[PDB]
Structure 1
């Protein structure tokens, strides 16, 4: 006996399947393992086939990697345009009077194991 089956799990994209599988229709009562992508963090979760031919509703389990906010530079401050994930770039701007020394806008990225800004935070110094 095994009436009803949970249809093929929807594509997460940010998670690659990680469990023995050789069929389209999955049997209810079975968690499928999925590991997020490098640019993501939240350990390997799993969607449980409940009964209504549906997979357990996953909350905020998977989340794109994010770099730690850079310390505000002396006589200045960085403004995030949206956020600080491995894709969003933060703009640096010193308070009126002193010009920034170093770069202009560092983009948050990822090497593979750990996320880090493409360029270290500049500085600020009175303009000659």
Structure 2
């Protein structure tokens, strides 16, 4: 009263023969297919004319233990057996080279990852910017990677004495915004002559006096707060030594 056995995706019959009718109590010899741990078993035709195979008879074969790449991680979403997949990511300051994923597939008479694990390499940087009248200090002057810091310094005169004022942040570091290209954290500083002041900025104010690309000692700057802003400090300031202003730069508060 049993029909022909089911067509199992995980198993095949050891000795298939031409037939389509089996009485209850009939046992047939089956085998696990490629990608499953080798096992020979029996399927039985039960009293209700339905075929029953033993529970968890065919176990999917395991692929090699994945490792986390150095400076990266391996992500096991299900397991490390036949048909499953793994993905890889690199850590902050590193970029992936190779395959970001692998699948556990049939390889010859066993199973294997259809891709090799990737490399997570340090994000490189271009040489930091050149600045007129100064330079940066580095043990390696032409090799930069994520995290590295460079400090700039102004050139001295022919007698080794201070000749310029270093204006702005003296240090910058190799970073990345996209996790692929290395960028310097900010702009390099400027090396300004000792009798000069760089153009002053006061938020929510305009200069009403003559603007200059660069000011000289005792040059005056007059500021005006924008509409609806209140002034704190004197509106007229003069260029001092060390890129300073006397009185100090004013402020505009809403």
TM-score (norm 1): 0.76
- Structure-2 change in CA distance of 1:20 and 1:117 (3 Å): closer
1:93 Cα offset (Å):
0.7
Which structure 1 segments of 5+ residues have no match? none
Give the Cα–Cα distance (whole angstroms) in 2 for the partners of residues 105 and 66 of structure 1: 17
Which is bigger in relative contact order (C-alpha 8 A, separation at least 6)?
1
Pairing of 1:116-127 with structure 2 (within 5 A):
116-127=112-123
1:38 counterpart residue number: 34
Cα 1:57–1:114, aligned 2, differ >3 Å: closer, same or farther? closer
1:107 to 91, 103, 117: 103
1:1-128 matches, cutoff 5 A: 5-19=1-15, 21-128=17-124
CA distance in 1, matches of 2:77, 2:19: 44
8 Å CA contact 1:66, 1:85 repeated in 2: yes
Would the aligned equivalents of 1:100 and 1:122 in 2 still touch at CA under 8 Å? yes
Q: What is the Cα-based RMSD across aligned positions, in Å?
A: 2.4
Report the Cα offset of residue 115 of structure 1: 0.8
| Bigger shift: residues 112-121 or 86-95 | 86-95
Unaligned 5+ residue runs, structure 2?
125-254
- Greater strand proportion: 2
* Alpha-carbon separation, structure 1, partners of 2:33 and 2:111: 13
What's the CA shift string for 1:29-84, capped at 9, x where partnerless? 33211122212225122112343333335211113333133112222111134444
Aligned residues: 124
* Counterpart Cα distance in 1 of 2:85 and 2:16: 39
Give 1 or 2 for the bigger CA radius of gyration: 2
The alpha-carbon deviation at position 107 of structure 1 amounts to 2.6
Counterpart Cα distance in 1 of 2:2 and 2:34: 28
